[PDB]
Amino acid sequence: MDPEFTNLIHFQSTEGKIWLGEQRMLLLQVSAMASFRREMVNTLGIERAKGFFLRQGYQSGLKDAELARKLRPNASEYDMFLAGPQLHSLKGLVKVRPTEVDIDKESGRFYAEMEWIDSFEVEISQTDLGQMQDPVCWTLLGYACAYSSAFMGREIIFKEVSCRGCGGDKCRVIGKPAEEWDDVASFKQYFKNDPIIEELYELQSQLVSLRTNLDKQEGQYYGIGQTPAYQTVRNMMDKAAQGKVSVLLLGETGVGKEVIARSVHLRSKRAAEPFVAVNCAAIPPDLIESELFGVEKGAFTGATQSRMGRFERADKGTIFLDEVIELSPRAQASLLRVLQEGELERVGDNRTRKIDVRVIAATHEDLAEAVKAGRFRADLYYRLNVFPVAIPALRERREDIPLLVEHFLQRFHQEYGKRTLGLSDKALEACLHYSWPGNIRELENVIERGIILTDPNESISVQALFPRA
Amino acid sequence: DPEFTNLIHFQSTEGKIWLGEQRMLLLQVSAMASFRREMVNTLGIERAKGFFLRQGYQSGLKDAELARKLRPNASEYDMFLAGPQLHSLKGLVKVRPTEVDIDKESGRFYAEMEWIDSFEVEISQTDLGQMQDPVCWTLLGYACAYSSAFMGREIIFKEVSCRGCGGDKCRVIGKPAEEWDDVASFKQYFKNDPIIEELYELQSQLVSLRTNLDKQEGQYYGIGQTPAYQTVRNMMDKAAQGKVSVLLLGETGVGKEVIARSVHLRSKRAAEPFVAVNCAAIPPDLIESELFGVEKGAFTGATQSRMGRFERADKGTIFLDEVIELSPRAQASLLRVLQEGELERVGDNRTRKIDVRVIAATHEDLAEAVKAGRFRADLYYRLNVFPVAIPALRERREDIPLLVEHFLQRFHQEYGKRTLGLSDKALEACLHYSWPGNIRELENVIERGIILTDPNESISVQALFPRA
Amino acid sequence: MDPEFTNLIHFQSTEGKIWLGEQRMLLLQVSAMASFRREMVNTLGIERAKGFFLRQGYQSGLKDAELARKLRPNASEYDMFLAGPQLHSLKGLVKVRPTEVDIDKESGRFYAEMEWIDSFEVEISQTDLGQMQDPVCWTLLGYACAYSSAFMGREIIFKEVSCRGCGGDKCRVIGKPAEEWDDVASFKQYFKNDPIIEELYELQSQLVSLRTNLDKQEGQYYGIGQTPAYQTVRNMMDKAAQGKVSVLLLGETGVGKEVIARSVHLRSKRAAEPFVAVNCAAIPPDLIESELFGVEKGAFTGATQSRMGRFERADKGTIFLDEVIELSPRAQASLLRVLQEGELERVGDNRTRKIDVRVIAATHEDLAEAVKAGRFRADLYYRLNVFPVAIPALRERREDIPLLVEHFLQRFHQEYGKRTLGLSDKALEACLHYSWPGNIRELENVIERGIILTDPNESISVQALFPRA
Amino acid sequence: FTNLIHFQSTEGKIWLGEQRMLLLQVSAMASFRREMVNTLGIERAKGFFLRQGYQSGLKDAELARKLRPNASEYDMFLAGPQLHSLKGLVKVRPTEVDIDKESGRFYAEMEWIDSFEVEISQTDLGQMQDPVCWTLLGYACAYSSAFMGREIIFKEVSCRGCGGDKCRVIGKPAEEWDDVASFKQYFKNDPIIEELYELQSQLVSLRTNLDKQEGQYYGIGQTPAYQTVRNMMDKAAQGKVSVLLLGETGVGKEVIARSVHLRSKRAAEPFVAVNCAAIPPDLIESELFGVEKGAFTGATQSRMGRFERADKGTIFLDEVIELSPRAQASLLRVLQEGELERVGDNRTRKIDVRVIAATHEDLAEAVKAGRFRADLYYRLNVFPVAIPALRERREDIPLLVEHFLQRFHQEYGKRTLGLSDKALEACLHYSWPGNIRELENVIERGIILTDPNESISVQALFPRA
Ligand SMILES: [Zn+2]
Ligand SMILES: [Zn+2]
Ligand SMILES: [Zn+2]
Ligand SMILES: [Zn+2]
């Protein structure tokens, strides 16, 4: 009580501004706040809106504590502390009736009990009422906690032992230091920010990525740039797409030649046509020939039913052949006939079948001396060497490594949350200085190990990948 | 200002501030800045924008009623200008109306105004980056509200430029909503959808989508204690206590494999491996090599030795669907495993004992299959010790609703979040059906009924088994 | 042992022929037969070799029974039946010891117990150091069953009760007519000659079809024959796909607009670039804008970490927008800016970045009258209506119904069932007389239900689909 | 010679020197080849009969060398074709012969009259536009190679089964031929049964992996630590006591709780696991106990909690320390009185839920900081169960890794047949901060980095060393 601050609330109406000391002020309507709190509780629940108003009262109380300290710096301990309730009476929030006070800034002692008459929160509560079985003066309590804590330096927690919105006779509150309370953990959880919008964004992102994981075979790599070698590889595949040339993918294991062939097929004039990939190592050669070219029924090797070969399955399209060196010699002769005249014969069949099939082979072994050993035909090598396309390893793309890895982090982050919000410059330096035999598979694997292995820290360990053992 | 400066009566001793007949309060601008900051940080920008817009709109309605009750007639322009004069009086903004055209009787309205020293831009200063959209929200709401209450028509302003976006001046234009082209963007702010319900809904969707991951037991037959389901349940639970092999006689598509899984879970060996085997797989020489393995050597064409499926069920349980489709050597080896607890891999001389419970199943009548020599009598009598007949849905008339209800909840979450309706005519049509396919056909028709349902709250009667 | 047996094996050394009665014969080494059986068992199954040798012995026994009948023509029942095993002894295969016999060709009664001394099959078992777990005298048993059956006129079946190759003391066999046996199926299974090469081709085809799921599906039911309505839609789709013009797909639910947009992207110049489809049925408020255009972190919005929008995911590529009418007005404005100026900015983002994204919107509701009442902006409507493409309901393409279902049937023939491709024309005539309110999705669903309701019947039953209530 | 094929019919045997012989019918061989081609094709049966004739020819070459040790250089080679004529296979007419054992030179051309293979071909006919005398050709090649010591290859330049007038064959050393790769490919064993077993195994594993996994981490024995942990979980399984799993990150506590649930008396009842760290606490409270509709907390529709979803069953709670204090009080009420209330609801609901909490942080001092309730800690610490790290189970490590390698070998269908004991020593000598999880990860990376039949390198895992 005892205001004596109306002389400092000077204001100039002509400019549309209100002042108090050096601080700007605003005059808001109470009915608007009533509808505001009504819709707030309707769209946020009660516990969440209570915590939000509590945090806002705490922030307003810290600001008013700074203001009161700027107003009368050398008043007195009690005279400075009373400015809080005096600010409540001045701003029209509540009328304060402190029935008991005990304060000593040096010893840390604190205790108070006060009555809040004509609280604006109980007045708006008459507009939005229902069960109202818990105290409603939330911003008042948060402002009280903030002002008392800023004045004492200790954590002070108030509790409205009685409130008019609960059917009680008078709003009465008690304030003691937090150490002298029984259960403060619930109150401290009331003070947490709990940003629901970020939780909603994370849930929507995880839900979209989890529902899109079906048919998730389009985004891969080979589409980032930033190194001259990749630019050469992409413009070279652009040149190969427009032409009818059979393409040979020279590279190393784990560089992703199959997705490269898929991109070359999509960039070609026959992108809508089927694309069939065949890993020659997966199929034993005795089955390799019959799978690549099919087989017709009959007494000659004839099974019960004719089966179309993979080349006819890719008619008007493209055939990819990984590890083409591992072909049976008769299959190599059939491939040479298909490549030079566009004709094939099913196994056990004498009649010919026309085809129009683009060919993209790939291999890691040095085919030039492989022909010298008799392991591969010379003519088929001559027909396949028309358009070599070298795909560099990451060791040839050292400066390109970081963009991939952070992208990989996102690819794992939504699967497991934004764990490891760091890069560990030592780990990045170790990644720049490594041969990487599995240039993209080993990278994805070690990044998976780094994501799973860094649970009790927000920064990736340098030992999580390339452990010293 | 004649003479509104005297309208702000306040008594400090009473702890109240008054304006006309309306109680009011005076807050700091920095506190409102932190208020808007935490508000936008907790909800979306549009949610907070709608909140502040509705707050300004309610304040404008109340202030229009107050100005109407203060000076009764006077003049039209003075009564309309009392709104912006109230804005200047409360410390919100300074108003500079550069153009006005008002006629309350005819309904004509147009106005262009400048908002100088808006407090909302002072709150925008706490956010170092410029906002991409105008920030004077409660100002716009109070403007539209006061203008609409003063005219009797709905009047809508729009901040064509704002200083919080980097503009030179806060400039607003106000004309009646019917004279606008696109008004829906303003009306979207008035819709108040509870964000917490969307959080619970998204968490429920993600939890339901990740709960469909790798669980083994969730299929059907809940606590619907129908006499037939209860008899079959007590039969399986009494069967689980022993090691006796159990034969599941029933109909195709009833899901005998999960029944065997439940029998294994109710058994004493639930922690031990449970392996199901469909005999529809080709049974030439591969059925024997897969069921009992094969050892490497020159005595058989095996480069690598391969463990059989029965050894994978060691100390556990093996399910055998369509047991009639076994080769006679496989029937003999199964009889040896069932009567002596021993087996030997193909091409292997040494023998190893095993402890494997057996759950066979078949749709064909096994008695007449043993007749004509298609199946050995020994294995038949060893497997028929504890038959468990699974009734068709035709005799399960009372279990049909509970099932479909669970299936509804099971499939409404499947990429659709749709209706829970049943349409009693469709339900009576469903209870009166032979169901040649028991559970598979019912789940298929339930999905087909889900196909032709818009998020209208009712499954169509004609969506199931249409006239043609 | 008989006057006619010795010296009956006429043979000419210089002429290169060996004869026995009227039958040509061959003399092979035992070690060669041992390596023969070794290669046979090492390449095929134990049962495959068992059935081959048993059938070979059966044919030899049938021919030798006819030979013994024509050699001594007068009956002497026991003498001819014992001449059978005596013929076994003459060829050097086995020594026979009939310990019990009971024969009456007229009454059909038969029983015999015999011992096989020095069987060559056990000597071949000696080359396989591991003892067989089952009796090894296969061709002997087949010759026995064949000779006894031809001599009696009834089917006679022997079984080796004990064998020296399985570790037994003596080779002991019992022969009685098949009707007098208890379990005969295990022996009868050896007469079935199922080609192993067909099983190899079938297993390779199944494994390849299951391993081809790693590749993205080549497409869906978009490719059908040149039906005039489908052909008009096809040529319109091709001329629209060549350009960057945004395409609006007006149609009905279940018509499959997404596969249409995917085919448009594959036929476009940006097929290698990402294609992202977005259904607006997902919850809209503030989430539709943040997902379509992203959001940047900062104090201006409740974003802890920035999230890329789906339009940025479609950079240089194509985005599909199903139910575009269900866009928030802010989303419609941002989409209009992206479509008219090629630029967008993330929510809460200060800097603007341009994008190059083709747009394919689609809707079942009529956009006309939707712009009325304000549900959709006129600017975006006129910008999207430049190239409408109406997709007819299946009622106008009933001539396409068989082509679809046939492709669907074989597509479902691989679905864990290896079931049927039949149609039953009455069911097709019942299908043509139906509105199909759900066009293609409902037809695929009823086809799956019919596959569930039909086992070996090849034509799906006419009554299997849509039975009466 | 015919004088050496003496035999005694009384014992049922035919002899030639010290080698036993047998007399087989030709009609049986005709049906044999018919069924062989019907179930194997033509090229496969051709290679089979070729190598079988090769084996018979090598055996007959050893026999002929045993018959006349001092046979002349010409007569010893001629013993082959006369053995062909003696056994009834073919009549031989050598039109040219040239042999020199020392220099390795060889050449011959001969006629095969009345071949039995063309005779059976007359019964089983069709295309047969390629030479049919397969076993004869293999026997000739084997005998000439065994006699010379060099690779000698014959080829039937003409055959009566191809419509030709006479069967004519030529034998030359393999180096002097143009295309020998086809014949050498004909000589390969080609075990089709092994390919069938491999395809069936890969197909069965590929069809069962789509049916979802159950668990794997448990069941690896032969170490004291695992045996103590398993007997502890066995003793804990029969009771209803709430269990606290104290361990380390990545030790696989969830599968341990699932095995304890299956070993318990409520194995048929539902089992629900919840990782508290994955769910933000603001959602943790509403998710563990549900929420009721009303003006309170929002909620357009009531939502069941995970505890009611696990009624009559068991709930696992990883990282129980990260619970909101009101959720901790509700969990203590559920634990000591078996009752719960949905958020925003006043009425109580009975439940019967077994509880297994787990944590990696030191729970004892976490209560001292005010981060966790004391009463709930006393109620959860009733039965602590420590799960050791792999460093305490080093002797068990190789068994795990071999099972791991097998589960990954089948992951790609055909992979390295080695472990490299040096790499095993490196695995035993590592802290493994991520037990079983880091082991699976390093093994997958090492397997992807190796592709031959060679042992996996120690640098494939723990590189840069
Ligand atoms: Zn109160
Ligand atoms: Zn402004
Ligand atoms: Zn025997
Ligand atoms: Zn010939």
Numbering used by the authors:
A (entry chain D), C (entry chain A): 13 to 481
B (entry chain C): 14 to 481
D (entry chain B): 17 to 481
What does the paper say about this structure?
As is typical of bEBPs, DmpR consists of three domains: (1) a sensory domain consisting of a vinyl-4-reductase (V4R) scaffold that functions in binding of an aromatic effector molecule, (2) a conserved central AAA+ ATPase domain bearing the bEBP-specific GAFTGA motif that is involved in coupling ATP hydrolysis to the restructuring of σ54-RNAP, and (3) a DNA binding domain that interacts with the palindromic upstream activating sites (UASs) situated ~100–200 bp upstream from the σ54 promoter.
Based on a solubility profile analysis and preliminary tests, we designed a truncated DmpR derivative (aa 18–481) that is soluble and produced at sufficient levels in E. coli. This truncated protein, DmpRΔD, has an N-terminal 6 × His tag that replaces the first 15 residues, lacks the DNA binding domain, and carries serine substitutions of two cysteine residues (C119S/C137S) that were anticipated to be located at the protein surface. The determined crystal structure of DmpRΔD shows a phenol molecule bound to the sensory domain of each protomer. The two protomers (P1 and P2) form an elongated intertwined P1/P2 dimer through extensive interactions between the related sensory domains and parallel coiled-coil B-linkers in a head-to-head orientation with a buried surface area of 2895 Å2. The two dimers—P1/P2 and P3/P4—form the tetramer, which has an antiparallel head-to-tail assembly that places the four ATPase domains at the central core of the complex.
